[PDB]
Design a protein around this nucleic acid. Structure first.
Ligand SMILES: [Mg+2]
Ligand SMILES: [Mg+2]
Ligand SMILES: [Zn+2]
Ligand SMILES: [Zn+2]
Ligand SMILES: [Zn+2]
Ligand SMILES: [Zn+2]
Lengths: 162, 162
DNA sequence: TTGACTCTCTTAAGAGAGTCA
DNA sequence: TTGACTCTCTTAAGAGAGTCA
């Protein structure tokens, strides 16, 4: 809602509901050849999802609360950060999933940062492979690797230099 | 349609024209605190751009050639790879700017890979900072670094465990 | 045959708000 | 009030195709 006490109340009910989502253990690469364990609190695959939650997309949900007879709605992963600035250097802050598991709503697996910072974690070597993110990664990004480039830089003539 | 020989001719005329674009010297980070030099062949900011070139968007261009009365058009950065496979692992190949300078059309600064591989280079530590791309980056990604996260993983209660 | 404009679309990380019951 | 659906938009790396003289 608008007041501090009202925002805290929204975060508390959200945490309580999400706290009852089934907990699934995920073993993940940490980088450096090491492996770790994450406990994700996953929103159900189909309705009902939990008090206040509704699906607006294949893997998108929203949390709804009616405060003073007026309904308020937020992206399901954004609630933990309702008291933080919604922007940073003119860029919109976004709920970034450290566990790379969209169904997970564990706030201990989420951070609040620019979309660019958010995306970049997909290629991070991980907490044990060189991660330099100030708010450390929980695991190596799923896209980290040598890649599969079909063709590299090349020229037929001699008009260019690197 | 166009024979192998005709495609080669299109690549040759494209190189001839791009080679005459202003050549700008840029000093860039390579990772490991090292600085390097990259020479970008930059398409003009406004028309005319060069023979065969036209702007279809703020930072998008196309290359056009008419062969035997039929007009052919390609994304401006895609020409170097016309004789290469156009997909890999079920993913479309895209022109990936190793120099991270959109206006540049220097073929020695481009590679052909998936959009995910392409995007990830934005966060790479660089050829001198740990790059593991099989087709090595020319410089450290512009977005590499500690990031600027506003809020980290947190909970108000004790419903969660990482 | 060309140049200089016009328009909408793809991905995969993220969002907004409306219609019914 | 609360649930279960519907639709489209944003970002920044990338695209294809039409009009007119
Ligand atoms: Mg993410
Ligand atoms: Mg790129
Ligand atoms: Zn999780
Ligand atoms: Zn990281
Ligand atoms: Zn360049
Ligand atoms: Zn690299």
């Amino acid at each position: 809602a608008l007041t501090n006490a009202q925002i805290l109340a929204v975060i508390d009910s959200w945490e309580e509901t999400v706290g009852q989502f089934p907990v699934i253990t995920h073993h993940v690469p940490l980088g450096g050849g090491l492996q770790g364990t994450l406990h994700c609190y996953e929103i159900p695959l189909a309705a009902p999802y939990g008090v206040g939650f509704a699906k607006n997309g294949p893997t998108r949900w929203q949390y709804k609360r009616t405060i003073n007879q007026v309904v308020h709605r937020w992206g399901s992963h954004t609630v933990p950060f309702l008291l933080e600035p919604d922007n940073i250097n003119g860029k919109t802050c976004t709920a970034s999933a450290l566990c790379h598991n969209t169904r997970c709503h564990n706030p201990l697996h989420l951070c609040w940062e620019s979309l660019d910072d958010n995306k970049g974690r997909n290629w991070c070597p991980g907490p044990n492979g060189g991660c330099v993110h100030a708010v450390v990664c929980l695991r190596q990004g799923p896209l980290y690797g040598p890649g599969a480039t079909v063709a590299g830089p090349q020229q037929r003539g001699s008009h260019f230099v690197v």
